[PDB]
Amino acid sequence: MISLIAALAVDRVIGMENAMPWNLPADLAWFKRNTLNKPVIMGRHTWESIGRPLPGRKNIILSSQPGTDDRVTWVKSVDEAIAACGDVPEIMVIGGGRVYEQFLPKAQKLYLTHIDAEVEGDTHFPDYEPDDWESVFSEFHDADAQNSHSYCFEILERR
Numbered sequence: 222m223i224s225l226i227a228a229l230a231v232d233r234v235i236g237m238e239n240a241m242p243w244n245l246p247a248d249l250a251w252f253k254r255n256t257l258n259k260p261v262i263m264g265r266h267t268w269e270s271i272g273r274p275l276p277g278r279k280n281i282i283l284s285s286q287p288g289t290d291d292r293v294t295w296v297k298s299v300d301e302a303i304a305a306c307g308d309v310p311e312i313m314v315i316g317g318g319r320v321y322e323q324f325l326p327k328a329q330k331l332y333l334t335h336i337d338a339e340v341e342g343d344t345h346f347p348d349y350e351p352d353d354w355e356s357v358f359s360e361f362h363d364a365d366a367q368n369s370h371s372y373c374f375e376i377l378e379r380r
């Protein structure tokens with residue numbers, strides 16, 4: 222059972238050259254509770270962004286090259302990454318764009334934050350056919366004193 226979890230700006234932008242131009246601590250909170258105690262699969266670039274392992278969690282990093290941090294598990298392929306998670310209720314793929322694209326056809330659930338922010342970036346969430354996905358949960362939030370933009374948490378499940 223694979224789930225992707227991503228924060229998407231307009232045009233499904235999930236990343237760019239620099240830090241995203243926003244401050245969304247509610248989305249961080251959402252990511253933390255939806256990934257808590259689950260194995261997480263990420264690309265090397267996302268591994269690098271995070272700086273250290275997500276705590277209380279198998280962290281699984283895809284790299285074509287051998288690993289460089291023994292605190293986490295390093296794998297050379299999508300299927301190795303899944304196998305490295307073991308036999309768990311739910312594997313979270315936390316990105317980035319190349320990893321999302323490879324895992325989406327395998328996934329049964331998406332956790333997306335849709336952020337009402339206009340950014341240009343080089344990396345985007347894959348197109349998810351909405352005939353393949355049913356939205357089971359949707360929860361919209363205005364920007365506030367803590368959150369720079371409005372955003373909406375959504376969970377979709379594969380049909």
Ligand SMILES: NC(=O)c1ccc[n+]([C@@H]2O[C@H](COP(=O)([O-])OP(=O)(O)OC[C@H]3O[C@@H](n4cnc5c(N)ncnc54)[C@H](OP(=O)(O)O)[C@@H]3O)[C@@H](O)[C@H]2O)c1
Nearest residue numbers: 264265266267283284285297298299316317318319320343
């Ligand atoms: N021309 C471009 O614009 C271009 C192309 C690619 C990446 N990037 C840049 O890199 C940044 C982030 O990209 P992203 O979020 O896509 O990164 P990401 O998924 O977090 O990390 C991608 C890295 O993860 C590893 N990886 C992913 N799938 C794999 C597989 N099936 N088998 C083995 N290794 C795998 C590779 O690591 P290794 O590199 O260690 O093998 C790959 O380079 C962006 O700023 C992006 O523009 C740019």
Ligand SMILES: Nc1nc(=O)c2nc(CNc3ccc(C(=O)N[C@@H](CCC(=O)O)C(=O)O)cc3)cnc2[nH]1
Nearest residue numbers: 226227228248249252253267270271275315316334
């Ligand atoms: N909804 C969602 N929001 C995100 O911010 C997000 N980020 C990634 C990948 N990038 C990152 C970058 C940093 C951290 C991170 O360090 N989070 C810590 C909290 C510490 C902090 O950043 O303040 C965590 O335990 O989640 C996680 C994922 C993948 N899917 C997402 N999905």
